Amino acid sequence: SLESTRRMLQLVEESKDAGIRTLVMLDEQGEQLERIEEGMDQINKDMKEAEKNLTDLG
Amino acid sequence: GMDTSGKQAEAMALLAEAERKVKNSQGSSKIEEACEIYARAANMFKMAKNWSAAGNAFCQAAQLHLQLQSKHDAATCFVDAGNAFKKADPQEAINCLMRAIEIYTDMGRFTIAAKHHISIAEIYETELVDVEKAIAHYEQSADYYKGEESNSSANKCLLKVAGYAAQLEQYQKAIDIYEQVGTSAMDSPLLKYSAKDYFFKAALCHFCIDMLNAKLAVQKYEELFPAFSDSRECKLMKKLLEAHEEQNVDSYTESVKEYDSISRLDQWLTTMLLRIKKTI
Amino acid sequence: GMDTSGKQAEAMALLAEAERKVKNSQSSSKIEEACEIYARAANMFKMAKNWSAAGNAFCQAAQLHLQLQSKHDAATCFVDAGNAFKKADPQEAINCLMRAIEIYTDMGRFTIAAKHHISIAEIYETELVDVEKAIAHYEQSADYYKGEESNSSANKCLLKVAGYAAQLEQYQKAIDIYEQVGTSAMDSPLLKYSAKDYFFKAALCHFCIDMLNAKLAVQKYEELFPAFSDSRECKLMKKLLEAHEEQNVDSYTESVKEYDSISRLDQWLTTMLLRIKKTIQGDE
Amino acid sequence: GMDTSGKQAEAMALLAEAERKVKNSGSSKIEEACEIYARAANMFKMAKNWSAAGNAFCQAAQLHLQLQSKHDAATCFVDAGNAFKKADPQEAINCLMRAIEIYTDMGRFTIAAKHHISIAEIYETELVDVEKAIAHYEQSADYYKGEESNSSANKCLLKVAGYAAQLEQYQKAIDIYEQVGTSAMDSPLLKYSAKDYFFKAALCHFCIDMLNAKLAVQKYEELFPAFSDSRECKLMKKLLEAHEEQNVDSYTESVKEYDSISRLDQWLTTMLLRIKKTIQG
Amino acid sequence: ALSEIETRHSEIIKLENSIRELHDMFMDMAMLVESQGEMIDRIEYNVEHAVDYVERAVSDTKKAVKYQ
Amino acid sequence: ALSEIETRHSEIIKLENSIRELHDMFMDMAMLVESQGEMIDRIEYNVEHAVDYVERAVSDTKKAVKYQ
Amino acid sequence: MAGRSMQAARCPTDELSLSNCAVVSEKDYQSGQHVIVRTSPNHKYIFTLRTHPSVVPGSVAFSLPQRKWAGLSIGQEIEVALYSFDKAKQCIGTMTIEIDFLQKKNIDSNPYDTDKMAAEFIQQFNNQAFSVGQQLVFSFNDKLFGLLVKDIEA
């Protein structure tokens, strides 16, 4: 029975480490997502201005 | 090698020559070239680790660009100036962020306005040790996000607002927000498991207002959410009510310590518990 | 400032100016400015908390774009008006959404049409509580998603529509949908573990038509999927079938109460169990 | 609503219009014809027809090809292949191969690799040709590796190794498994899973002979110590010790004991059966 | 005797603590994943709008310059 | 024995099986999430390329057309 | 009187709370009147009004037993309307009350003179309205107990 508890302890420790790694990497993921979200708005605004200017010139 | 001497020298030379160029203009290409050189000098100064000069150059470029019909470029330059000024003096960052928020809201979009409001609230809380203006900014951001059906960010902002209101002894708003958020999260396949926690927080607020009010709120919550009847928070609050109903402080302390042993209490929970204990 | 009266007055004056300007022009070049000023008025109304006025302005802008040779801008105005009217006028929002869906499906794009169909079904279910139209819209969205090689969204739509059909006593549709989704999860490495759940649901549906069919379906699932045997759901189903055979309602009640004690059950599970309970109680 | 009949009638009308317009042939006429073909294909897809839509997409692709336009033809061909995914696998494969040939001209490796992966999926899900699937997966793996995409260049290698092991080419499977395990052990995130690969490699070595399995297990243990304190290695040692004296009872008892705690998939049971039937004799 | 009793009494609380920590981590994970999914949906909408406008603008300018 | 040993054994076995399932789930989570991360990293570079290209193109074309 | 909305409040003083009479502002009503407080469409409880200084007009102060019996929370809206008694039938000739210990600290085995206390009850709340199911506190010599109304006889 003691060996059983040892096995559960080891397994739960491993699971906790895996969860910790997932949390940190996902924090990085979210930072990247925020960066791309910031960029796309400027993309769209500049494109809209250029399209309106080109249409007006013609 | 990244010595700042050459970077600073080049930046000041560029600034001086651009000032000379713009000054001569008493047709509009001069303003455009001046703004370009201003942006380049600001970037060079930022590379030189001097943030005040970079922010000043950014602000001057923003003003010059706004002098023309183009306005979104001014907003971009102003937000960059605020980011640069976040180090030395937050007041100028707040002013330029407010101006950028005004321009962006005038344009029509609001999500970026909400993000800038969140940034301003964070700056207020971190630097100016002020909570009321932070509360107002969080409320405005939450309203803006809810206007676009952005439930998660609005819920987080409302959570922060309710927490800060509770810190300031404004229990009614805190309980209202906590109840609303708990009810909203009860009907989700992922957030459901957290619906208990919020309720507990609200319940604690009731204890500050009165005892029988807290008991009735607990009964209402348990009836509304039967699964709340097995969580540790309900048992702790039942034990605290039992101890507090007969002027028993010893049992109160033993229950508090027993619960805290399993899980460490945060500043908010421990402060509220100390207040409740001091009540009687 | 934050004063609502001033913003409302400014928006109303701007809308009146735009209306008189468009009326004067009616007496191509000025229609673009009319559309821009209408959009600005709609934005001001939205920020003035007058959702109805903003939706009306968006609809007028959409019409002014429709009369011109432009479709995408008209559809964008349609969706803006629908979202604005979601809070106040559900029917006008539904009309705007369906017109925009028609526009997209005419252009060719499909996924956005599926998302808007799901939104229409959601509003129908949450406000007008009309099950049939929500079911039809979910079926259309699932078909669109499957046609685009999207399986997860199609699977979720199929699950929702099957659950709604089961709630409406149409057991065969739910049974077939659950079996299909169970097989789909069966042939995957990730969802494999959850694959049991769907099968269990199917079993319950069979118990609603006949108990012999329930046994046959349970045996078919067992032979097809050996891992379903060790799961507690199979043991519960077998014990319930045995109790139904012996007509001992007490054993069924005790087993169900114990299963509820170990873990809670959703409304669907309890209502189906109650239906089975009354069906068996009729026998005794 | 309108039923497939009206949609088919409209699509046929559009097709006839495009055919007549191309008949009297110039840039405007061909552009209108290709646009009408695209509209007819979209309507056919709406009408649930999956054969006419593919033909219309192919016709549009050919019309674009004859004109000085390349990526439009590739898009039309991939759309035709997607439409043919449920109509005729051969036509979809041909269209996807043409799209890959067009794409790889300009150096767009990722799209070609994805198309090759889809082609291998077609070849392995319905058709029973595993050599072509292995070749396509190897091509996709090479394409992904050429762009330093080691993370996305490992799944294909694992699939190829598994299929090669299923095809008795144990040397290639062992090499791929060992390479993948060596690459993974360095990564702390993927370290936990690396054990499995090594275990599989051990099995592949056991399929040949017992001494090879013993030496390979010793080499893995010395190279990577944690593999020695895992249940799979315990099973490997027990099986190696038991088989030496021709005792099938111990072999089957250990296999059942391992299966009890955790179930084994088709590949593992097949390999165990092969090993028992081959070496236990 | 009491050695095994204390060992059994000391090998149970740690599991509870680890499990509770895992629970909290998983809950936070779920919330942030929902937020990220919403963000990605907005991302997709913006990208679709941008590409559609690109097609429209390029076609319009090409035809205009062709006709002069 | 009686309830004692049967409870011990049954609960221990069930807990072990569940924990193994959680371990496998977490491994698969990590693999797929790493794939998603590299996918987003791939997005980023092309996003930057597109923004730079569009900015330069619009500036140059506007200047050229205005001067002519 | 007419059923106007007001608010529940805490008792101003311990003596008034122990009087078992709801405290009301002197500007609203006079002592001796009866009001049937209406909380829900199917929840109406009779109470008597006593006037005490302080207490903002427009609110009624209740003690812990009354709030527990009627389940009122501070700040909750409540409707109060005057109640008129029918002497021909509502006159109370006898009542049945269950008595229990209020605090477990003060438990003792001393004999209790049941009759001696009876007169005191009459001396305490004579001419005061009582309803079936009303829970109240009772003050014996250096003793606090809880009383619950179970039956009423004319």
Token representation of residue C192: 């494999």
Q: CA of E51: how far to CAs of B169, C112, D34, in Å?
A: 51, 14, 21
C265–chain B Cβ distance below 8 A for any pair: no
Rg (C-alpha) for chain B, rounded Å, is 27
Q: What are phi and psi of D201, to 5 degrees?
A: -55, -45
CB-based contact C193 F21, cutoff 8 Å: yes
A17–chain E Cβ distance below 8 A for any pair: no
Token representation of residue B258: 């027993």
Q: Which residues, 6+ apart, have CB-to-CB distance to C210 below 8 Å?
A: none
**Environment class of residue C21 by beta-carbon count within 10 Å: exposed (0-12), middle (13-18) or buried (19+)?**
middle
Residues of E in contact with A9 (CB under 8 A): 11, 14-15, 18
The amino acid that residue C231 corresponds to is S
Q: Which residue of A lies nearest to F57 if distances are taken between CA atoms?
A: A50
How many CB atoms are closer than 10 A to CB C174? 25
Token representation of residue D193: 């899973």
How many CB atoms are closer than 10 A to CB B65? 25
Query: Do the two chains A and G touch, given a threshold of 8 Å on CB pairs and at least 3 pairs?
Result: no
Q: Which residues, 6+ apart, have CB-to-CB distance to D36 below 8 Å?
A: D14, D15, D17, D18, D21
Q: What are phi and psi of C225, to 5 degrees?
A: -130, 95
How many CB atoms are closer than 10 A to CB D81? 26
Q: How far apart are CA C52 and CA C42, in angstroms?
A: 10
Q: How far apart are CA C100 and CA C82, in angstroms?
A: 9
Q: What are phi and psi of A50, to 5 degrees?
A: -65, -45
Q: What is the 3-state secondary structure (H, E, C) of C196-221?
A: HHHHHHHHHHHHHHCHHHHHHHHHHH
Beta strands in chain D (DSSP E): none
Q: How far apart are CA B141 and CA B147, in angstroms?
A: 10
Cα end-to-end span (Å), chain A:
85
Query: Do the two chains G and F touch, given a threshold of 8 Å on CB pairs and at least 3 pairs?
Result: no
Q: Which residues, 6+ apart, have CB-to-CB distance to A49 below 8 Å?
A: B72, F58
Between helix C4-26 and helix C29-47 the angle, nearest 10°, is 160
Q: How far apart are CA C211 and CA C231, in angstroms?
A: 20
Q: For chain B, which chains pass the contact test of at least 3 CB pairs under 8 Å? A: A, C, E, G
Q: How far apart are CA C118 and CA C200, in angstroms?
A: 27
Q: How far apart are CA F14 and CA C231, in angstroms?
A: 11
Q: Is C25 left (phi over 0), alpha (psi -120 to 50) or beta?
A: alpha
Q: How far apart are CA C227 and CA C231, in angstroms?
A: 7
Name which of C43, C83, C264 is nearest B227 (Cβ-Cβ): C264
How is residue D24 annotated by DSSP?
-
Q: What is the DSSP string of B231-247?
A: SHHHHHHHHHHHHHTTT
How is residue B229 annotated by DSSP?
G
CB-based contact B262 E30, cutoff 8 Å: no
**Environment class of residue G108 by beta-carbon count within 10 Å: exposed (0-12), middle (13-18) or buried (19+)?**
exposed
Nearest residue to C239 (alpha-carbon basis) of C262, C218, C265, C209: C218
CB-based contact G73 B246, cutoff 8 Å: no
Beta pairing class for G22-24 and G94-101: unpaired
Q: Which residue of D lies nearest to C227 if distances are taken between CA atoms?
A: D263
How many CB atoms are closer than 10 A to CB C107? 16
Residue showing tokens 């989700």: B188
Q: What are phi and psi of G13, to 5 degrees?
A: -140, 155
Token representation of residue B169: 């002894």
Nearest residue to D57 (alpha-carbon basis) of D30, D39, D32, D31: D39
Q: How far apart are CA G20 and CA G64, in angstroms?
A: 10
Residue showing tokens 């059994």: E8
Q: How far apart are CA G36 and CA D267, in angstroms?
A: 80
Q: How far apart are CA B167 and CA B205, in angstroms?
A: 10
Q: CA of G47: how far to CAs of B201, C100, C102, G148, in Å?
A: 35, 63, 66, 16
- Within 175-214 of C, beta carbons closer than 8 Å to F belong to 189-190, 193
Residue showing tokens 């005490």: G52
Token representation of residue F26: 């977490």
How many CB atoms are closer than 10 A to CB C196? 20
Q: What are phi and psi of G78, to 5 degrees?
A: -150, 145
Helix (H/G/I), strand (E/B), else coil: D148: coil
Cα end-to-end span (Å), chain C:
74
Residues of E in contact with A19 (CB under 8 A): 22, 25-26, 29
Q: CA of B168: how far to CAs of A16, B133, B134, B161, B165, in Å?
A: 37, 13, 13, 11, 5
Beta pairing class for G94-101 and G143-153: antiparallel
A6–chain F Cβ distance below 8 A for any pair: no
Separation in Å, CA of C9 to nearest CA in chain D: 46
B2–chain E Cβ distance below 8 A for any pair: no
Q: How far apart are CA D30 and CA D161, in angstroms?
A: 49
**Environment class of residue B210 by beta-carbon count within 10 Å: exposed (0-12), middle (13-18) or buried (19+)?**
middle
Nearest residue to C137 (alpha-carbon basis) of C169, C163, C113: C113
Q: How far apart are CA B96 and CA D258, in angstroms?
A: 67
C72–chain E Cβ distance below 8 A for any pair: yes
Bridge partners of G148, per DSSP, are G98, G135
Q: Which residue of C lies nearest to F22 if distances are taken between CA atoms?
A: C193
Q: CA of F50: how far to CAs of B43, B257, C144, F43, F44, in Å?
A: 22, 59, 31, 11, 10
Residue showing tokens 């469409």: G41
C112–chain E Cβ distance below 8 A for any pair: yes
Q: What is the 3-state secondary structure (H, E, C) of chain C?
A: CCCHHHHHHHHHHHHHHHHHHHHHHHCCHHHHHHHHHHHHHHHHHHHCCCHHHHHHHHHHHHHHHHHCCCCHHHHHHHHHHHHHHHCCCHHHHHHHHHHHHHHHHHHCCCHHHHHHHHHHHHHHHHHHCCHHHHHHHHHHHHHHHHHCCCCHHHHHHHHHHHHHHHHCCCHHHHHHHHHHHHHHHHCCCCHHHHHHHHHHHHHHHHHHHCHHHHHHHHHHHHHHCHHHCCCHHHHHHHHHHHHHHHCCHHHHHHHHHHHHHHCCCCHHHHHHHHHHHHHHHHHC
Residues of C in contact with F25 (CB under 8 A): 193
Handedness of CA E10, E12, E13, E17 (dihedral sign): positive
Q: What is the DSSP string of chain G?
A: ---EEEEEEE-S-HHHHHTTSEEE-TTT--TT-EEEEEEETTEEEEEEEEE-S-S-TTEEEE-HHHHHHHT--TT-EEEEEE----HHHH--SEEEEEEEES-GGG-------HHHHHHHHHHHHTT----TT-EEEEEETTEEEEEEEEEEE-
Helix (H/G/I), strand (E/B), else coil: D222: helix
F58–chain C Cβ distance below 8 A for any pair: no
Q: What are phi and psi of D245, to 5 degrees?
A: -105, 15
Do residues G16 and G52 lie in contact, with contact meaning Cβ atoms separated by under 8 Å?
yes
Dihedral, C155, C158, C160, C166 alpha carbons, nearest 10? -140
Which value in Å is the resolution of this experimental model? 3.1
Beta pairing class for G4-10 and G59-62: parallel
Q: How many residues does chain B have?
A: 280
**Environment class of residue A33 by beta-carbon count within 10 Å: exposed (0-12), middle (13-18) or buried (19+)?**
middle
Q: How far apart are CA D225 and CA B26, in angstroms?
A: 79
F30–chain C Cβ distance below 8 A for any pair: no
Query: Do the two chains D and A touch, given a threshold of 8 Å on CB pairs and at least 3 pairs?
Result: yes
Do residues C37 and C60 lie in contact, with contact meaning Cβ atoms separated by under 8 Å?
no
Residue showing tokens 């014809």: D33
Q: Which residue of F lies nearest to A22 if distances are taken between CA atoms?
A: F30
User: In a mutagenesis test of the E interface, which of A7, A11, A16 is the best target, namely the one with the most E β-carbons within 10 Å?
Assistant: A16
Q: Which residue of C lies nearest to B102 if distances are taken between CA atoms?
A: C1
